[PDB]
Ligand binder design. Structure first.
Ligand SMILES: [Zn+2]
Ligand SMILES: [Zn+2]
Ligand SMILES: [Zn+2]
Ligand SMILES: [Zn+2]
Ligand SMILES: [Zn+2]
Ligand SMILES: [Zn+2]
Lengths: 540, 70, 533, 97, 100
């Protein structure tokens, strides 16, 4: 249109006129230039298959577990074994409460769910949220042979684990995030960690945390640095693809999917800093995917998916990093003439190797194409240029950090007001405390099962280990990402008064809308009555 | 070779039904390229190449058939 | 019969696949075979993802096991000793009583870790035959961690070869198969996990309100952040069938409309719920100045040969007509999408022209035959939904839009462009290409819906950097914060104007009668055949 | 120091009137264009009127409920931060400056 | 017959009285609803026992009044247009049209 001919406008009254082989082109507004090409298009054949057996035939063969109490609760939060197809059937809204096959909510069900809610205030409106897997089937076998005398069911174990998950997530939400004191402690710990070992996250350089991806200290109304409520990472909005910032909890892709793990960067030994996923789904350092040539970003405005995983040639792989020397991951090469040394991106960062993104913005760096104008200049400790100081100390720092990780992997933790309660794990996973054991015990009593407190403790330990296995990612798909967290007592007080007034407002609003529903049913009856009278008044 | 493959096949023929199903299971788990294994799950047949099977899974199957035949 | 051995040392067996896949038998025999694992069993090929996980866990707990490539470095901070403040203020103080925040009886011990790992290793022989192995296969023809190892995808009952590798979590992608629940859209590896999840997701419907329900088809107008998890799951499934759906995590804005094939199963004497099998979707932005009414669309391969793609585009355009706004799909487009939109714009323009013809022939006898009408781009756009650029680009493919060679611009009264229908037969066949198709068409009365009236938030629960009134309101209300008002207060009293009308049929009748009453053109001004190309 | 207290409450302050105005205008549209003589017309009209009425009532109800839960969790977190500060005062010796 | 007319039209009259009373109910109820902000911010009664919660306006119309820095008198009144809940039904819009 606008690229085709300007002698025609939309509202232009064009006269309609009608009396009483074709191979298609291909437009594209690319780099300001249209395209032209005959009709050649994807012809790949699709393939699927309707499997001949469902999980119906794969159901268990025997039900050896006799839940003789709250069986109604089980069967009503699980499944064990013109009227409906007319315009009269309304459009289900997002608030359609299930009144569907054989629900028949009884007083027994109501008493059961109220008992479940009274088990702990956290379990009001409870919902089984975890599905036991293959490895858990065996642990349930071992339990129900050791403690519960062949009477605990799979649904019982699922509900136990889900109560654990719910209670733990309530504690998680209400965990205080930061005060001035603990924030000072964290920043001092980070300053020490950097000044001793080195940091590939930008932390520690100053009390003002720097950008993780681009190592910058710029922050304006369009490129303002964000902070993550999962870890001490700070990334420019453009330099990290933060297209929007929710009001409370901002979690990086790692802190959102691999909730807190020190997951592996396929092109680096180090596992701290900013991360994105790949088209395959392994967390790759963003600084890596930037500086590695055959790695490229797909959606420059989101920077989200990393691509080029299989496009790297084995030369880069079999290259060696003179910093960490781990025989894995990819490695960039120096730009010095007659040089062939290699090293990981974050390795160079941590060791303080001379790096320069050039005059190319990070967009132009992830642009997937390096032009002769683009020069992503990284050097060696003997190839660094003038103005930059030799990084022998940086080599020492990186070697210290990584040999420290190694001596940690070899070392063991060598073991009344005083109370050294340990509730985490070296993987930052939870440890279900004694109150959680009591809660599970209450649940087992609720279901009427042989209930060894030692069995409760065993289930809690098993849940902690299940989370350590899953690797930070929650056992279930539960999320209330409202950030109570870093708020302050006074802010909570303002919000409570604000919510009081808003509760009054919403109460009168529900009054109005109840009147609205009543009047609407009235008007329905009005139309019905109008028909019921006019049918005979007009037509005998 | 620490296994006699002909007598191993003899013991395989001696194994009962569920023992055969378990052999199938372990082989489908530990199928590597150096082995030549084929499995028609749709119709349900299973063929293994003993000569390509490595000594590891061979001795494992040998222990299995010893346990399930004696 | 049940077993045989050839002389080449190949053992032919026969077993029942159902008994082979039965979960209880499978896990029992897995614990049986569990110890028989020869730790020196070769791994000269695809290293098991489950074994990678369990070895990661082993080297995490520092149980020395290096039978495979190597252990991984980042596992902890060196200061896990009694110096971490978290050991003296457990759970941020959320628990008060000592008898309730103590954990001496639950901090897992070495023996308990060994027990857990033992169950794990007894499961290893059960997982590969549960998740990684398929229930059916047909692989027709003509290190391994950098790219995917995903090989199938199971929705409601089918398997699917994924056209493109999606960014699932490694936990899921390094598997071979992956089940994805049709309703919940949760993605789990083990068919056992899927069995339990199918036992639990009794909410047989997708979330979000329902804005269209004809026969078996139905739409669900799932909002963008009333349920953000479901939408992230849907996006991660969609990346397996779109080449350029990169906006698959931060989906607060996108108002995902989701098509579904409702099914009424009462096979069991108890269950009769409407199983709402997810079929296709089209993510549409919530506020876009660039006039996009469909950002990213797909129907699933398992549901092709049913025209649901064309139906879903037709529904997007019905929605745009209802909004009385002009929109086109996002310009960076699928090469296949480019051709399907060529076809759809052609068919829509042909349909609009056919409506014009039938109306003019309703007015055939009373209106003089030599009198020709003058329709416009906007006249077509208010009828279809596509922007006028789209209408001309979908008319040129129909080859009914002719122009004049020379420009006698001295007199502005002269016609520049014309619409010259070559053959009503040609156009009726171009349109009848759908009649023989018998595709699901958008019965424009069933839609119950209204525009997405934004406040100051624009729908998102946060703030993003991106008509002009709100686009400036966003940037003005943006102001720095570390870790003039009252929009929409009048949208109810926008009826007092007649310029914009409510219903699509009203807009259609309005523009149609407006053009019928537009001044006619005699057949004599330009009857020169050569001058029109 | 503080923040715009509306930003934490975007849901009930903004998206409650958004959907409310929307469904109200929608009911208005249907009733205004309820062709009086049309039998299935008025049938669908009355049915969807009742529908959207239930919808708006349930929307304001659900927002009431979510604000109740938010009040409860807010005061809980208030007492929890009380706990946290009261405790963390003591460990100043161990925790660095 | 005529008896059917009597019974149906008396049902209709009663339901019409109920419907008009519900109309008036919503009318005066939103009247009080939008005057509550004026009697809640300037002279705070409900949203504040004493003058402490300076943000006591209204959900729908009040966006800045829910900010303590709002010290002006902009949202003290309203109009019959802003009365959204009444406008919902079409009968009320037609009556307002006749009365306009
Ligand atoms: Zn940056
Ligand atoms: Zn993070
Ligand atoms: Zn890296
Ligand atoms: Zn290194
Ligand atoms: Zn060099
Ligand atoms: Zn589900």
């Amino acid at each position: 249109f606008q690229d085709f001919y300007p002698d025609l406008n939309a509202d232009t009254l064009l006269p309609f006129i009608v009396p009483l082989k074709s191979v298609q082109t291909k437009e594209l507004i690319f780099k300001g230039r249209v395209t032209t090409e005959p009709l050649v298009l994807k012809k790949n054949e699709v393939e699927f298959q309707k499997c001949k057996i469902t999980t119906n035939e794969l159901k268990g063969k025997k039900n050896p577990y006799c839940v003789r109490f709250n069986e109604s609760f089980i069967s009503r939060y699980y499944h064990i074994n013109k009227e409906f197809d007319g315009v009269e059937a309304p459009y289900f809204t997002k608030f359609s409460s299930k009144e569907a096959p054989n629900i028949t909510i009884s007083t027994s069900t109501k008493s059961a769910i109220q008992k479940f809610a009274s088990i702990s205030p956290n379990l009001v409106n409870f919902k089984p949220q975890y599905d036991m897997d293959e490895q858990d089937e065996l642990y349930l076998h071992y339990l129900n042979k050791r403690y519960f005398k062949d009477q605990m069911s799979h649904e019982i174990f699922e509900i136990l684990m889900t109560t654990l998950e719910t209670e733990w997530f309530h504690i998680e939400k209400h965990i205080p995030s930061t005060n001035s004191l603990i924030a000072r402690h964290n920043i001092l710990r980070d300053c020490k960690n950097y000044e001793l070992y080195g940091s590939d996250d930008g932390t520690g350089l100053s009390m003002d945390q720097a950008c993780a991806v681009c190592l910058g200290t710029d922050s304006d109304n369009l490129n303002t640095i964000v902070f993550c409520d999962g870890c001490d990472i700070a990334v420019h909005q453009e330099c990290y693809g933060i297209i929007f910032i929710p009001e409370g909890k901002w979690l990086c892709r790692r802190c959102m999917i691999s909730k807190n793990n020190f997951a592996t960067c396929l092109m680096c030994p180090s596992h701290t800093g900013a991360f994105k996923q790949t088209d395959t789904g392994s967390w790759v350092h963003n600084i890596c995917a930037l500086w590695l040539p055959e790695l490229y970003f797909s959606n420059l405005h989101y920077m989200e998916p990393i691509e080029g995983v299989q496009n790297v040639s084995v030369s880069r792989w079999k290259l060696n990093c003179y910093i960490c020397k781990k025989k894995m991951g990819a490695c960039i090469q120096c730009f010095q003439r007659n040089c062939f040394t290699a090293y990981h991106v974050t390795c160079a960062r941590r060791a303080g190797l001379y790096m320069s993104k050039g005059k190319c913005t990070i967009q132009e760096l992830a642009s997937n194409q390096f032009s002769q104008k683009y020069s992503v200049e990284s050097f060696c400790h003997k190839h660094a240029p003038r103005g930059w100081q030799t990084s022998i100390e940086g080599i020492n720092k990186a070697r210290k950090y990584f040999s420290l990780l190694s001596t940690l992997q070899t070392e063991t933790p060598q073991h009344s007001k005083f109370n050294k309660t340990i509730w985490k794990t070296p993987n930052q996973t939870p440890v279900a405390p004694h109150v959680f054991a009591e809660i599970l015990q209450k649940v087992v009593d609720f279901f009427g099962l042989a209930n060894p407190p030692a069995g409760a403790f065993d289930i809690c330990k098993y849940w902690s280990m299940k989370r350590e296995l899953t690797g930070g990612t929650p056992l279930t798909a539960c999320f209330e990402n409202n950030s109570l967290g870093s708020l302050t007592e006074e802010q909570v007080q303002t919000r409570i008064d604000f919510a009081n007034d808003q509760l009054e407002d919403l109460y009168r609003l529900k009054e109005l809308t109840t009147l609205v529903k009543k009047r609407t049913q009235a008007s329905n009856s009005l139309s019905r009555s109008r028909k019921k009278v006019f049918d005979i008044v007009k037509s005998p | 070779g620490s296994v006699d493959l002909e007598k191993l096949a003899f013991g395989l023929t001696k194994l009962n039904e569920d023992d055969l199903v378990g052999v199938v299971q372990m082989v489908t788990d530990n199928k590597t390229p150096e082995m030549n294994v084929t499995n028609n799950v749709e119709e349900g047949e299973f063929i293994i190449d003993l000569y390509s099977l490595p000594e590891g899974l061979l001795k494992s199957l040998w222990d299995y058939v010893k346990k399930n035949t004696e | 019969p049940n077993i045989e051995v050839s002389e080449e040392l190949k053992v032919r067996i026969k077993y029942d696949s159902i008994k082979f896949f039965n979960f209880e038998r499978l896990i029992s025999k897995s614990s049986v075979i569990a110890p028989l694992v020869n730790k020196n069993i070769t791994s000269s090929g695809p290293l098991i993802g489950f074994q990678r996980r369990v070895n990661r866990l082993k080297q995490t707990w520092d149980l020395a096991t290096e039978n495979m490539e190597y252990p991984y470095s980042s596992d902890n901070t060196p200061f896990r000793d009694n110096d971490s403040w978290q050991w003296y203020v457990p759970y941020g103080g959320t628990i008060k009583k000592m008898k309730d925040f103590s954990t001496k009886r639950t901090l897992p011990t070495w023996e308990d870790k060994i027990k857990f790992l033992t169950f794990l290793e007894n499961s290893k022989s059960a997982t590969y035959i549960n998740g990684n192995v398929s229930l059916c296969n047909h692989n027709e023809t003509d290190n391994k961690v950098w790219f995917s190892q995903i090989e199938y995808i199971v929705l409601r009952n089918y398997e699917i070869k994924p056209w493109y590798t999606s960014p699932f979590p490694e936990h899921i992608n390094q598997n071979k198969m992956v089940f994805i629940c049709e309703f919940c859209l949760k993605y789990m590896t083990s068919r056992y996990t899927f069995y339990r999840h199918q036992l639990k997701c009794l909410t047989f419907k997708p979330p979000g309100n329902e804005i269209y329900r004809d026969g078996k088809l139905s739409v669900w107008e799932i909002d963008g952040r009333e349920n953000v998890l479901y939408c992230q799951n849907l996006c991660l499934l969609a990346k397996c069938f779109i080449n350029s759906k990169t906006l698959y995590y931060d989906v607060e804005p996108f108002i995902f409309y989701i098509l579904t094939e409702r099914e009424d199963t009462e096979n069991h004497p108890y269950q009769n719920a409407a199983k709402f099998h997810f079929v296709g979707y089209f993510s549409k932005e919530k506020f876009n100045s660039n006039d996009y009414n469909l950002s990213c669309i797909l129907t699933l391969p398992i549901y092709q040969r049913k025209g649901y793609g064309q139906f879903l585009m037709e529904f997007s355009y019905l929605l745009s007509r209802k909004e009385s706004k002009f929109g086109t799909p996002e310009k960076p487009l699928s090469d296949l999408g480019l051709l399907t939109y060529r076809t759809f714009w052609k068919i829509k323009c042909a349909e609009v022209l056919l409506k014009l013809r039938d109306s003019a022939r309703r007015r055939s006898n009373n209106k003089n035959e030599d009198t020709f009408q003058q329709v416009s781009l906007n006249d077509i756009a208010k009828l279809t939904g596509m922007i006028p650029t789209d209408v001309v680009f979908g008319l040129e493919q129909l080859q009914v839009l002719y122009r004049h060679k020379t420009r006698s611009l001295s007199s502005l009264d002269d016609f520049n462009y014309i619409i010259k229908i070559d053959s009503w037969n040609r156009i009726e066949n171009i349109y009848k290409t759908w009649s023989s198709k018998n595709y699901p068409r958008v019965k424009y009365d069933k839609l119950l819906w209204e525009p997405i009236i934004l406040g100051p938030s624009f729908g998102i629960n946060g703030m993003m950097n991106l008509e002009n009134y709100n686009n400036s309101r966003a940037h003005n209300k943006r102001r720095r914060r570390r870790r003039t008002v009252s929009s929409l207060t009048e949208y109810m009293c926008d009826y007092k104007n007649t310029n914009n009308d409510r219903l699509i049929y009203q807009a259609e009748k309005r523009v149609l009668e407006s053009i019928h009453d537009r001044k006619g053109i005699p057949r004599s001004k330009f009857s020169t055949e050569t001058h029109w190309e | 120091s503080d923040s715009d207290i509306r930003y934490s409450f975007l849901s009930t302050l903004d998206h409650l009137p958004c959907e409310l105005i929307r469904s109200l205008r929608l009911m208005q549209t249907i009733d205004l264009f309820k062709n009086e003589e049309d039998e299935p017309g008025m049938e669908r009209a009355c049915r969807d009127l009742l529908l959207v009425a239930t919808y708006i009532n349930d929307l304001v109800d659900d927002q009431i409920h979510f604000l109740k839960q938010h009040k409860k969790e807010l005061e809980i977190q208030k007492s929890v931060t009380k706990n946290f500060n009261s405790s963390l005062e003591n460990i100043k010796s161990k925790l660095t400056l | 017959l005529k008896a059917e007319l009597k019974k149906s039209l008396q049902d209709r009259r009663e339901q019409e009285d109920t419907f008009d009373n519900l109309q008036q109910e919503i009318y005066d109820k939103e009247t009080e609803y939008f005057s509550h902000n004026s009697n809640n911010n300037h002279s705070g009664h409900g949203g504040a026992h004493g003058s402490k919660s300076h943000y006591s306006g209204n959900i729908i119309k009040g966006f800045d009044t829910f900010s303590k820095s709002h010290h002006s008198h902009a949202d003290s009144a309203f109009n019959n247009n802003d009365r959204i809940f009444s406008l919902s039904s079409a009968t009320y819009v037609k009556q307002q049209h006749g009365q306009s």
